[PDB]
């Protein structure tokens, strides 16, 4: 009929927490173009034993 078309707005502001805990298959499968392009200061500084 003519119910309220807006928020409560005193509705639940927290987690469900029974919401979906899995990984959505239809997520973003591409690389984020504006991701971290710098070198990682905390990375492997040693020498790979399996290197050529």
């Amino acid at each position: 009929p003519n119910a309220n078309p807006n928020a409560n707005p005193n509705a639940n502001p927290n987690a469900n927490p029974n919401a979906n805990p899995n990984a959505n298959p239809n997520a973003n499968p591409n690389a984020n173009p504006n991701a971290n392009p710098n070198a990682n200061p905390n990375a492997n500084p040693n020498a790979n034993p399996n290197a050529n």
Partner: nanobody
Amino acid sequence: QVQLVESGGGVVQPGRSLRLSCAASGFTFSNFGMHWIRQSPGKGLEWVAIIWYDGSNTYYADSVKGRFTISRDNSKNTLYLQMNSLRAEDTAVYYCAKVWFGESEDNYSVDVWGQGTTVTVSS
């Protein structure tokens, strides 16, 4: 402090090629990704390309994809932009810029811009 010096700009006829270079100093160049950004009076500021610190991933704006090639020489601390098949609308001031340091999951942009070099494409 951080300093970036562009060179290679000038007048070029449409259809020819031109290679811009950007010399970096004051920081470890090989540890940072870089942008090329151009500025023209007609379009304002316009992002052109981005390159990863190791060159593994590069991205280009749609208006330049397939014509421009961004590369780098970490042994020389030099950033390059090879521009082929230039059109009249590519006339602009081109800046190289350094990506800022941030957190691992943040998005990234540039913090230090170069001086800029002028490219005028005209017959």
